[PDB]
Amino acid sequence: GSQWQPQLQQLRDMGIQDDELSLRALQATGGDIQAALELIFAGGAP
Secondary structure: OOOOHHHHHHHHOOOOOOHHHHHHHHHHHOOOHHHHHHHHHHOOOO
């Protein structure tokens, strides 16, 4: 995941406006969306 923007777009596809949120969940995961929704779900880390 480079810049995580394709990943942003992965959520921007679903209608997620929380880019500020997502980018951080992305940084936390390393560049995964499916894992990001879990980081987001927990709100910090598993």
